[PDB]
Amino acid sequence: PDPLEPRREVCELNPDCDELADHIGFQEAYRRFYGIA
Amino acid sequence: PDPLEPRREVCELNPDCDELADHIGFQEAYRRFYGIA
Ligand SMILES: [Ca+2]
Ligand SMILES: [Ca+2]
Ligand SMILES: [Ca+2]
Ligand SMILES: [Ca+2]
Ligand SMILES: [Ca+2]
Fold it and tell me: Where are the 4-carboxyglutamate modifications (chains A, B)?
């Protein structure tokens, strides 16, 4: 199982993160909207 | 963007495919419930 699925679902839920994910990826997009720095 | 996202969503929707996906993967699980052979 993929440990990142929970975060991937969170991002999909956020249109802005979802859309962005298609360009720079999910892990980098998640960080952009939720990471600190 | 990942071209497989549509199929991944289909599988997640199917509990049986979802569960199975965690063990042998999504592409092999999808094939198991929807592929022909
Ligand atoms: Ca999921
Ligand atoms: Ca999903
Ligand atoms: Ca998406
Ligand atoms: Ca999706
Ligand atoms: Ca899943």
Answer: 5, 9, 12
Please state the domain extents for chain A: 5-34
C-alpha span between A21 and B1 (Å, rounded): 8
Q: What residue in B sits closest to A26 (Cα-Cα)?
A: B1
Residues of chain B with Cβ-Cβ distance to A1 below 8 Å are 22-23
Task: Please report, in angstroms and rounded to a whole number, the separation of the first and last CA atoms in chain A.
Answer: 29
Q: How far is CA B5 from the centre of its chain?
A: 10
In this structure, what are the phi and psi dihedrals at residue B4, rounded to the nearest 5 degrees?
A: -85, -10
Which residue in chain A is spatially nearest to B20 when comparing CA positions? A1
Angstrom resolution of this structure? 2.0
Q: How far apart are the first and last CA of chain B?
A: 29
